[PDB]
Structure 1
Amino acid sequence: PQFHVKSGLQIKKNAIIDDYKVTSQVLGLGINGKVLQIFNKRTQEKFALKMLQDCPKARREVELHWRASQCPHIVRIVDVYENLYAGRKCLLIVMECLDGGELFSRIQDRGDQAFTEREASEIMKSIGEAIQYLHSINIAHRDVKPENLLYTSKRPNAILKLTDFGFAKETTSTPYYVAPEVLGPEKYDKSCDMWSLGVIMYILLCGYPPFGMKTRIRMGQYEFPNPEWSEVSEEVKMLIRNLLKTEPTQRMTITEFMNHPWIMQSTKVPQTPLHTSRVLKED
């Protein structure tokens, strides 16, 4: 008998200062709180600390992230503390310190020798299975943006990981013949992750977003303007087109995305160079 099982979420109640040295160095800012760099007193290694005000909404978002941490392409939660900061109660999330910078920053800070079509596909597949894992366990991320994609280290061997579960939500409430519609109700959710994914691929290839701009998005109108898109194949554009469907119910599912040849065969796509890096050094 073999029985694979992992630990549940243990919310530690003791002061974080017992276990960790807390710096005044920032690695992330938002409206909801801050992300600081911390060191483990015992092991002496680098970590990230996300501070949130302790409301039931946050406690669930942590539970979803903790549940998601088993995925190699999702930033892993290590410890969760509930402490008293100021007068208010608050949550303290301990994560693996990702100091490899933002995704587009590292593509731009290459001093580029050009950036290939193949390497962009490798990036996409990794973000793909990050979404695939989430969707497979009924979690929609709902905030997949360039800011929330960070690399582990400064290494050229670094792993890309998806952060920020401040918008993640649970998509759930003989017979192997029944339809998925009859199996309970579900809103849009997962589809918006797929849109974000399509957006990211566009910016990855050329170097600019595809998009009354709020109308041009709702129209689904975007050029593939040259001489950037003159090198990219019809197959790739058709994939972006499938990911950039206006209608959510028409937009490609994650399972279909990962099955697609360009994604599945990350090591078969032509190694044709892109102008991406040059384009980012403008705005």
Structure 2
Amino acid sequence: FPQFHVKSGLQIKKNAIIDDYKVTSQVLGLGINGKVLQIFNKRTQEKFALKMLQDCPKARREVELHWRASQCPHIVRIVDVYENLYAGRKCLLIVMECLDGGELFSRIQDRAFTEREASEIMKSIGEAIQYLHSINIAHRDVKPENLLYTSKRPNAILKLTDFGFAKETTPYYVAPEVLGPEKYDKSCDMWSLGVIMYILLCGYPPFYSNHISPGMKTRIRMGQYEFPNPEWSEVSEEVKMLIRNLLKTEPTQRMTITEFMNHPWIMQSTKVPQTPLHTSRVLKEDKE
């Protein structure tokens, strides 16, 4: 009879963090809610990440959510959380596993890149969002810089981070709506999969400037994007048809993750053609 649906709660440590870590000044990632500093476990040398919040309702929420989320091996692990006094104020100090193999597009950006790595990547991010949605959490800021590789070792796991914007989203014949209203917060995660998938396939976003920005906003609202050659020349209608169903402008039209995750292109990611893509070249050139 089911057990390991039982995992430990979060005990918030109250001792000062510097008992346990050396807080260096290296910013790993500026991020939301403050910054993200690299720190070091004192009694094992090992490497970790700190993000600091002034304590409040919002912050207790970030911590509650990210904690529930750490279960999933594609969300970045919360190792420890401290309540400490800093400069007179209460703080939550969030100690994360340190992921240091780079940002998704950063890694891609320096090497060839195939449709198949695209799909594999997209399966991964796909699992992180399936897990959030199944325990009723919407992330709400899935973006390139929140998608990080663990090491620089070429099978690094990719992991989703930053719960600064996350919200709880809340008879065998009862319909989903009858088990209580979901707003529509859960489908921006899906738009996001869309935008990432697009970038992965070609090196640039479906919607950008021209500095052209009242024009970008229209283009977004209007859902005007396209699949220009050369980059999209060898990309199958199947793949294009998927992005179109994520980038729908009407949120109640997009696919759910369950539908995403069942798509033959994600489900059998390891069977997709290894078709060579521009992603990495477009990525060196378009740095600017």
TM-score normalised by L of structure 1: 0.96
3-state DSSP of counterpart to 1:240: helix
Number of residue-to-residue matches in the alignment: 278
Cα deviation digits, residues 26-56 of structure 1 (max 9, x gap): 1121463121111111222100001111111
Output the CA distance in 1 between the equivalents of 2:68 and 2:169. Answer: 14
* Paired-residue identity, %: 100
**Offset at 1:135?**
0.3
- 1:281 and 1:194, CA in 2 relative to 1: closer, same or farther beyond 3 A? same
Quick one: distance in 1 between partners of 2:241 and 2:131? Answer: 24
Specify whether residues 266 and 11 from structure 1 end up closer, same or farther in structure 2 by C-alpha distance, changes over 3 A only.
same
Q: Distance in 2 between matches of 1:200 and 1:52?
A: 28
Q: Secondary structure at the match of 1:133?
A: helix
1:203-234: CA deviations, max 9, x gaps?
00011000121011111111110011110000
CA distance in 2, matches of 1:83, 1:187: 35
Structure 2 residue 252 is matched with structure 1 residue 252: no
Q: Aligned-pair distance for 1:89?
A: 1.3
8 Å contact 2:231–2:278 — kept in the other structure?
Answer: yes
User: Are residues 3 and 132 of structure 1, via their aligned partners in 2, closer, same or farther at CA, if it must alter by over 3 Å?
Assistant: closer
Where do 5+ consecutive residues of structure 2 fail to align? 208-214
The 1:63/1:207 distance shift into structure 2, 3 A limit, reads same
Using a 3 Å threshold, how does the CA distance of structure 1 residues 236 and 23 change in structure 2: closer, same or farther? Answer: same
The CA deviation string for residues 94-135 of structure 1, in whole angstroms up to 9 with x for no partner, is: 00101111000000111xxx1011111000000001000000
For 2:161 and 2:24, the matched residues in 1 are separated by 21
CA gap of 1:186–1:4, structure 2 versus 1, over 3 A, is closer
Is residue 159 of structure 1 aligned with residue 162 of structure 2?
no
Displacement, 1:4?
A: 4.4
Give 3-state SS (helix, strand or coil) of 2:238's partner: helix
Judged with a 3 Å threshold, the aligned counterparts in structure 2 of structure 1 residues 181 and 236 are, in CA distance, closer, same or farther, namely same
SS of aligned partner of 1:31 = coil
When residues 2 and 75 of structure 1 are mapped into structure 2, their CA distance, relative to the original with a 3 A threshold, is closer
CA offset digits 1:127-163 (Å, max 9, x no partner)? 0010000000000000000010010001101000001
Instruction: Select the residue among 182, 192, 195 that pairs with 2:191.
Output: 195
Using structure 2 for the length normalisation, give the TM-score.
Answer: 0.94
In 1, Cα distance between the equivalents of 2:216 and 2:3? 55
CA distance in 1, matches of 2:233, 2:31: 39
User: Where does 1:223-234 land on structure 2 (aligned, <5 Å)?
Assistant: 223-234=226-237
Which stretches of structure 1, 4 residues or longer, exceed 6 Å deviation after superposition? none
- Following TM superposition, by how much is the alpha carbon of 1:3 offset from its aligned partner in structure 2, in angstroms? 5.2
Q: Which moved more, 1:123-132 or 1:18-27?
A: 18-27
Q: In the aligned structure 2, how far is the partner of 1:185 from the partner of 1:119?
A: 37
What's the counterpart of residue 31 of structure 1? 32
Gap runs ≥5 in structure 1: none
